[PDB]
Amino acid sequence: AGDSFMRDLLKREEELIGYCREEALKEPAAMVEAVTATVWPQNAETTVDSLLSQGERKLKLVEPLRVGDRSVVFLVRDVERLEDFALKVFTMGAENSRSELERLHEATFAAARLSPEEARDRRRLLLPSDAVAVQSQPPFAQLSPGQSDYAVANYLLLMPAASVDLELLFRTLDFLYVLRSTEDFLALHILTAQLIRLAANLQSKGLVHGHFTPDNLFIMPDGRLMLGDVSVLRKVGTRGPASSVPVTYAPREFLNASTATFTHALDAWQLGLSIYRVWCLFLPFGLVTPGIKGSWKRPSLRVPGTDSLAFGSCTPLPDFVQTLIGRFLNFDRRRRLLPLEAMETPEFLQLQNEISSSLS
Amino acid sequence: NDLPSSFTGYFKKFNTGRKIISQEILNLIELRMRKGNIQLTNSAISDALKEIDSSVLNVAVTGETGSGKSSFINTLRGIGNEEEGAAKTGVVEVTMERHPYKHPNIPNVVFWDLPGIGSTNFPPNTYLEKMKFYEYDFFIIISATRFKKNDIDIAKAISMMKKEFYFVRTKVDSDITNEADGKPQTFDKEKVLQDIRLNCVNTFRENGIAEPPIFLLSNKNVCHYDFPVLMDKLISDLPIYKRHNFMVSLPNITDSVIEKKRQFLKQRIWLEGFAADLVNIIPSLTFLLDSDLETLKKSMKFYRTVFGVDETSLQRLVDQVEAMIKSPAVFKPTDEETIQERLSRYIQEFCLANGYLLPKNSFLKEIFYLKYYFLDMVTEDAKTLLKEIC
Ligand SMILES: Nc1nc2c(ncn2[C@@H]2O[C@H](COP(=O)(O)OP(=O)(O)O)[C@@H](O)[C@H]2O)c(=O)[nH]1
Ligand SMILES: Nc1ncnc2c1ncn2[C@@H]1O[C@H](COP(=O)(O)OP(=O)(O)O)[C@@H](O)[C@H]1O
Numbered sequence: 001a002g003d004s005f006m007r008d009l010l011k012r013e014e015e016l017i018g019y020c021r022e023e024a025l026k027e028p029a030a031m032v033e034a035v036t037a038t039v040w041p042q043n044a045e046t047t048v049d050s051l052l053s054q055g056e057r058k059l060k061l062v063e064p065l066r067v068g069d070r071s072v073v074f075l076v077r078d079v080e081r082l083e084d085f086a087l088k089v090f091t092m093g094a095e096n097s098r099s100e101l102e103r104l105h106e107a108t109f110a111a112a113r114l115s116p117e118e119a120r121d122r123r124r125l126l127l128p129s130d131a132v133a134v135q136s137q138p139p140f141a142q143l144s145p146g147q148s149d150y151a152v153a154n155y156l157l158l159m160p161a162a163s164v165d166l167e168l169l170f171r172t173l174d175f176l177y178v179l180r181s182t183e184d185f186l187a188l189h190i191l192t193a194q195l196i197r198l199a200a201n202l203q204s205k206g207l208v209h210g211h212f213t214p215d216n217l218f219i220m221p222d223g224r225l226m227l228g229d230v231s232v233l234r235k236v237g238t239r240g241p242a243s244s245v246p247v248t249y250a251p252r253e254f255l256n257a258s259t260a261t262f263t264h265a266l267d268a269w270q271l272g273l274s275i276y277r278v279w280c281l282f283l284p285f286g287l288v289t290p291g292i293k294g295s296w297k298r299p300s301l302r303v304p305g306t307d308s309l310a311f312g313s314c315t316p317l318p319d320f321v322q323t324l325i326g327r328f329l330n331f332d333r334r335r336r337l338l339p340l341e342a343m344e345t346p347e348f349l350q351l352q353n354e355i356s357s358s359l360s
Numbered sequence: 361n362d363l364p365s366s367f368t369g370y371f372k373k374f375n376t377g378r379k380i381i382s383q384e385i386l387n388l389i390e391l392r393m394r395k396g397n398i399q400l401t402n403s404a405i406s407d408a409l410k411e412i413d414s415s416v417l418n419v420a421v422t423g424e425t426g427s428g429k430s431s432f433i434n435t436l437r438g439i440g441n442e443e444e445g446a447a448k449t450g451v452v453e454v455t456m457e458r459h460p461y462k463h464p465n466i467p468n469v470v471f472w473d474l475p476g477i478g479s480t481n482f483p484p485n486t487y488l489e490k491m492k493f494y495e496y497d498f499f500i501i502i503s504a505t506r507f508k509k510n511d512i513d514i515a516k517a518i519s520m521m522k523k524e525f526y527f528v529r530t531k532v533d534s535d536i537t538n539e540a541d542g543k544p545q546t547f548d549k550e551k552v553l554q555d556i557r558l559n560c561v562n563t564f565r566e567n568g569i570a571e572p573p574i575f576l577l578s579n580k581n582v583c584h585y586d587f588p589v590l591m592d593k594l595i596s597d598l599p600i601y602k603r604h605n606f607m608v609s610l611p612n613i614t615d616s617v618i619e620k621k622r623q624f625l626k627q628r629i630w631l632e633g634f635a636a637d638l639v640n641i642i643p644s645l646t647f648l649l650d651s652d653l654e655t656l657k658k659s660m661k662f663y664r665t666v667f668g669v670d671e672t673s674l675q676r677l678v679d680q681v682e683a684m685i686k687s688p689a690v691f692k693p694t695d696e697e698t699i700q701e702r703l704s705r706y707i708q709e710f711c712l713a714n715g716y717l718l719p720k721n722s723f724l725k726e727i728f729y730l731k732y733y734f735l736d737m738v739t740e741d742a743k744t745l746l747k748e749i750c
């Protein structure tokens with residue numbers, strides 16, 4: 001902590017974050033309403049059964065939190081447990097076909113082996129608490145009552161609720177840049193160090209993620225930064241579909257075949273992109289960054305464009321941060337700086353020391 | 361009560377720092393006057409007015425694409441963003457070349473829209489050289505929303521050269537709107553402005569740059585925030601001889617801008633009157649040659665344009681607008697009185713209120729009391745219309 005600073009900042013800007021959160025629900029209002037009406041058609045509570053060993057629960061809707069490309073995430077309450085959760089609800093594409101959701105379930109709940117309490121108490125990876133199905137309806141298959149244009153699968157994922165995801169934080173700062181005092185700007189230093197340590201955690205476990213993106217990076221109520229989407233975790237060096245990497249977050253070397261080898265350099269690249277966005281809000285290299293002003297429109301690195309790393313339109317940033325970003329964003333994948341090694345560099349040691357000194 | 365003393369003494373009635381000629385030139389004129397060679401005195405004055413009129417002002421505006429550079433330039437020229445001659449977004453970044461924009465009424469005042477350094481491949485010092493930093497009277501960094509590394513790299517480079525620049529934070533109206541909408545429970549407009557201003561001051565300090573003049577403003581609401589104080593600061597930094605041309609080019613955004621313009625023009629009339637030489641006859645018993653009458657009509661047209669009550673400005677606001685003010689009617693003929701009769705009436709009003717401005721038995725020529733009267737009339741007209749605008 002570190003974490004304490006970030007916790008206090010979110011509390012200070014709670015009203016603003018809340019405003020921007022609600023603003024982003026406006027465009028997909030139809031989707032949000034249709035999904036809400038499917039899961040809570042009549043009562044404020046829906047009774048659900050665990051697909052694992054957790055038995056039966058009643059989930060009360062508090063409010064919608066966020067919309068994704070294939071989902072809506074709600075804040076819900078298990079009143080009997082006196083516990084709030086994020087509940088992720090999936091729309092049916094096929095992007096979330098029944099088989100894809102069965103596979104997502106198995107990968108998700110296998111990920112701890114790749115111990116649930118321990119991975120939970122270590123607080124780097126955001127693990128789901130449970131997977132549930134609305135009572136008396138087959139799991140995975142479409143949930144009734146079906147609403148037009150928004151079929152919902154009967155498979156609901158229960159997780160700890162983050163305070164904010166980094167994508168929403170960046171969208172919030174792009175609306176009103178609340179960092180003004182010298183102290184305020186420590187937030188960007190802290191997030192830079194936290195992102196590096198998060199990636200280093202993956203490297204130490206010999207795992208690759210490949211979805212290390214702001215919408216999967218979460219500041220928790222205690223200020224801890226965690227990484228979600230645990231189902232994508234793979235052992236380093238394994239092969240898999242390249243399409244599973246978001247295209248704007250894919251290194252150039254990942255855009256050349258349908259199958260790819262998953263390497264630590266992949267996450268090191270994505271780490272560089274996320275640190276760049278901390279200081280810049282938009283992605284580097286002109287890559288399209290939806291929801292952010294100043295973004296250009298380059299669809300991916302295979303489309304010809306500006307390949308030199310430019311910082312001119314960023315918030316002014318320390319030279320040691322610039323250096324680290326530049327090394328994480330080396331186009332030569334074999335020379336690309338990895339995060340464990342990054343933490344030993346003079347640049348990281350300087351970043352750490354000035355944060356500790358500022359917080360002392 | 362000798363005439364050279366009366367001449368110099370007029371300028372001492374004006375706010376210090378707010379004169380249109382230096383003490384040096386004023387002392388030169390006071391001296392030639394005491395000599396008594398009227399040609400020599402007339403020349404010194406004519407020369408000073410020549411130096412004032414021929415002064416060119418070059419104003420550089422740099423900043424990120426979309427930061428408000430063209431809007432700023434258009435605002436200072438009193439031109440709409442969609443009107444003819446307006447600077448537009450996108451062009452400089454495309455060409456990566458600076459583009460001049462003359463003030464439509466005072467073509468000696470020139471604004472230069474500079475491409476953002478990010479639109480070029482020049483490092484800070486190379487950018488400043490390629491953009492001819494040393495040729496500008498003012499070098500203004502335009503910045504919207506939040507600091508960019510480019511903004512600071514440019515400023516630091518200027519700081520290193522032991523030179524100076526102005527910093528203008530645009531779009532503060534948008535900052536205030538977003539604070540009010542996003543954080544209504546803690547919203548304080550004054551407090552927001554102060555918070556942003558202090559971020560600007562402190563950001564320069566933290567980068568080892570001497571605190572520059574800093575102005576928070578909105579191109580969409582020119583009569584508010586820091587636009588008038590920016591105008592005051594810019595005039596005050598100029599060499600004395602450049603002040604007149606810039607002052608008269610300023611948009612008539614507040615009463616205070618309008619009134620300061622009047623004060624400057626009163627000093628010009630005083631110089632013009634002494635250059636034309638004083639007479640030994642009261643103006644309330646004189647009349648005007650046709651040459652004088654033409655000079656007067658042209659002086660009225662100039663004052664009207666300077667204060668934005670010329671016919672073209674009225675049309676951009678017609679018989680109903682003219683009817684609101686006095687200046688359009690002055691030269692309209694009537695069977696009721698001649699133009700000589702109307703103008704003598706004006707002298708009576710002026711001189712009854714103000715006196716003859718000189719020691720006994722000495723007078724300015726009638727035309728200069730009339731210029732004073734027209735100047736007062738036009739400035740009131742300017743304020744009257746501004747209130748309708750506002
Ligand atoms: N609300 C607000 N909008 C502004 C202000 N200044 C400029 N704009 C708008 O911001 C956009 C970019 O301004 P512009 O002058 O064209 O930027 P330039 O690229 O630096 O020339 C335009 O839509 C302007 O209308 C301001 O002070 N307040
Ligand atoms: N536990 C959680 N707490 C808060 N927000 C979450 C949580 N899980 C996901 N989100 C947010 O919900 C949105 C959708 O989640 P995501 O996993 O990206 O689904 P999709 O595959 O539909 O994009 C994202 O903005 C994400 O940050």
Ligand SMILES: [Mg+2]
Pocket residue numbers: 068069215
């Ligand atoms: Mg997602």
